[PDB]
């Protein structure tokens, strides 16, 4: 896409196993097919291109094993409309995440929902999530042989001047969101 990135940030409510969890949403406007972003979303080797290799069922009624993230299950899978997976991310609690897919004239609107009941675990969700949005960017339409840096950012508080900032502005818009969000 030769345009302007148009990301909408949003918040909202999503139920999971803990109870009814506050969800934070990222609506964003690629100028490729549904097509191009479902073979992205669901299929392994697309998915590592951009975020992290899936291990296991990979299927709805089974599970799934993100190496060096997060564990869980599949609760739905829906073509092309939206996949849909619970998330067990260590240390924090368990969440209901989504990647859905809605076309819309020469592009593609890109919806993924993080639902969990820490509100710490939202903003810093918010920055990794559209972490993974900045290499599917590329991944979709930019340009992506192969990311070099795979999550070799700044997590937490790492002493570097652009990605401690750039990290920060993701969680800042996510923080005061999810403060709205309640």
């Known amino acids: 896409m030769a345009s302007g990135q148009a990301t909408e940030r949003a918040l909202g409510r999503r139920t999971i ?10 609506r964003q406007r690629y100028d490729a097919p549904v097509d191009e972003v479902w073979s ?11 975020f992290i290799e899936p291990k296991g069922d990979l299927r709805e009624g089974g599970n799934f094993a993100l190496q060096g993230n997060a564990s869980g299950d599949i609760l739905r899978c829906e073509p092309p409309r939206r996949l849909t997976i619970s998330w067990v991310y260590e240390g ?4 209901e995440v989504e990647l859905r897919l809605s076309e819309e004239g020469d592009g593609t609107l890109l919806e993924l929902e993080h639902a969990t009941t820490s509100e710490q675990m939202l903003v810093e969700v918010g920055v990794g999530w559209e972490m993974a949005l900045d290499f599917l960017g590329m991944f979709i339409r930019g340009d992506l042989p ?9 997590e937490e508080f790492e002493p570097s001047p652009e990605m401690m900032r750039i990290s920060q502005e993701r969680g800042e818009a996510w923080a005061a969101l999810v403060h709205s969000g309640s």
């Open 17 to 26: 196993p803990a109870g009814e969890a506050r969800s934070i949403i990222i």
């Open 92 to 95: 924090k609690p368990d969440s």
């Open 146 to 154: 192969g990311g070099p840096v795979p999550e070799d950012a700044a």
């Open 40 to 50: 992205a979303c669901t299929d392994p080797n697309r998915i590592n291109r951009w």
